[model samples]
Target chain A: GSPLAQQIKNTLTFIGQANAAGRMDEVRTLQENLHPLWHEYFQQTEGSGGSPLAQQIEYGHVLIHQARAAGRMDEVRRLSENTLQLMKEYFQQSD
Target chain B: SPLAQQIKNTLTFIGQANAAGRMDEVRTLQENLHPLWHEYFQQTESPLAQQIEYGHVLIHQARAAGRMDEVRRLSENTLQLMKEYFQQ
Candidate 1:
């Protein structure tokens, strides 16, 4: 598996667990871990010539983080799931 | 040009205020962009649009909770993302 793909997979799992456990502190810490990977993914999007996928991921990062900050668990849960789904699709297609 | 230009200007102003430690100003300026923000997503992709909305909500919450550092980072990151997305 690609390192980035692996990271995404792992983070999604971690996010699910943290969210389920109500350990937002862990969620907070774990989410930031994706920042580097997120930037890497952004660059990958740019390198691949800027699709809607690229833009979606770019915006998704912002929304998920914001959701977490605002304590809007519903938004965070829904948006994060959507975000991961988008990323998984993009990754599979790219690979 | 309509919605994006205004959004970029707002982000730029917020960036400046954030750098200067003007938390209140940043909060006020960000909240005032709600209308433009709505117009903005209407002109963009739905997925990307939600991201833009969520991003702002977080920034607003961060500022409201007195998380100046997080607010500063969020403002800067949001500005960077806008520039990258709209090529501003």
Candidate 2:
């Protein structure tokens, strides 16, 4: 559903994709290679509110880490989904 | 060591911390940058110097507040400006 989001190649997108695929094992590996690529997209947004989007992404990441370590892929998946949804809204056309 | 090269070394670490998405690490590295900048450019009237000084100040402030993306903006801006100054 969020193709542009998929193409950005940050940990958030990679984590989300792995979450969707039930490939929870790879989340930590991907996290090890932090991408920080979202900033480029955030700058192109119509408003100056990309900070909020970045905050959500960061917050979601911590939660994803907690859930993954605790053996809760379900929580990880939901967290990834919400973050990805917000990410798409902000970055859809910016891609 | 030349202050410019020292400053460049510090900035390289900041870049690494930033790219790794390590907010805490970036926060520490940013502290290392602030003092170097103050020492590097004593010219208060020079916007070129202040551009970097204030830029790191903004970067430090943004990181302290947990403003991840804003940190990115300031970090990106200052380093870019650093190179522009580098060519001088």
Candidate 3:
């Protein structure tokens, strides 16, 4: 999983602790660890954030990173749901 | 000497490689690098200046990046740069 699963887990753990304790470096490091993946993802897709339905779903991974880094759990959950909805829509279109 | 300055610029070129995370590029750079350094040494008669100059640039970049591991490696290279400088 390319440390991604672990990175999400690490981010959650880091976020949970920092929210409780407010440690600056821990917060910064967690975001730092997340930045490269976002950078690469954006580089690949050119920030196609305003595309049509399927494209938005496909680009949800980008928003997931952004939401997590920004500490927007509600937005992350919403985007995760949007991703699943997109997957179903994609399958329907292909069929 | 200008020899040191030339080598320092050479190390900056190498630093750009490191920032991009390309180790293979180093060898390619070294091909031209050795010839250029040698040419400068032959013309200027001071290989040591080249060494310290390159060493200084490498160490400076590593330290700037917060890369302790790289800093240590370049510190060793600095010793060699000085040794080569004094030997000449």
Candidate 4:
């Protein structure tokens, strides 16, 4: 994997951990910081083919964006819980 | 049945709001209520209990789709169910 892919996956893992721990501050920072990077990465990868990770990544980003805009911790908390499970599944597949 | 007083009171509020055509209040009130109903649902088990709690989901779905009228309708039914059951 390229550095971008590596960083994205690692950050996804950390965000998953923070989300599980209910650490909203860390979750918020990590989520926002990855925004541009993921979009850039998506632009580079989208429409190339049906990359499962790419599709999941795109799906997860939409939820995260809405969660952030939700602006309430509880709203984002619920939203993140759903998104984190996808990351969990991705990790499982990668293993 | 046997709902907490809080449930009883919110249902009362919802009924009043719906009667007054304040669906926005009814919508928010119904949304605020799932936490309590969800707790009650988990604390017990039965088909009746499940429907009682799942009704919250219906209300949520209704609210999401600009269906305030449906929310009012569901809240009215919920109020009746809560009353009938809480009396048990």
Clashes found in each candidate (C-alpha, N, C closer than 3 A) = 0, 0, 1, 4
| Model 2 Cα lDDT, one tens digit per residue, B1-88 | 4877977887778778879999767755555555456546742235777688678656644543457698778877877787677668
Which residue runs of candidate 3 sit more than 4 Å off their true CA positions?
A: A1-9, A50-95, B1-88
TM-score values for chain B across all models: 0.58, 0.63, 0.46, 0.65
Predicted candidate 4 versus true structure: per-residue lDDT over A50-82, tens digit per residue: 267656645555544444444556767776776
Q: Estimate each model's TM-score.
A: 0.44, 0.38, 0.27, 0.42
TM-score of chain A of 3: 0.42
Q: In model 2, how large is the Cα lDDT of residue A94?
A: 54
Per-residue lDDT over B1-88 for candidate 1, one digit per residue giving the tens place of the 0 to 100 score: 6678878888789879989999867765665554356446645634555666666666645543445577668766665566566662
Model 1 regions lying over 4 Å from their true place: A1-10, A20-23, A47-49, B1-88
Candidate 2 to truth, TM? 0.38
Ranking by TM-score: 1, 4, 2, 3
Candidate lDDT values, in order: 0.63, 0.60, 0.49, 0.62
Residue B18 Cα positional deviation in candidate 2, in Å, after optimal superposition:
15
Shift in Å, residue B52, candidate 2: 32
Q: Which stretches of candidate 2 lie over 4 Å from their true place?
A: A1-15, A35-50, A93-95, B1-64, B67-88
lDDT of 3 by residue, A1-95 (tens): 33433343344444435534645445434544444443333233333342365355445644554465456767755665555456445434535
Instruction: Pick out the ten consecutive residues of candidate 1 chain B with the lowest summed lDDT.
Output: B59-68
Clash pairs for candidate 4: B1-B85, B1-B86, B2-B85, B2-B86
Show the lowest summed lDDT stretch of 10 residues, model 1 chain A.
A39-48
Assess the local accuracy of residue A6 in candidate 1 as a C-alpha lDDT between 0 and 100. Answer: 72
Q: Enumerate residue pairs that collide in model 1.
A: none
Q: How high is the lDDT of residue B75 in model 3?
A: 56
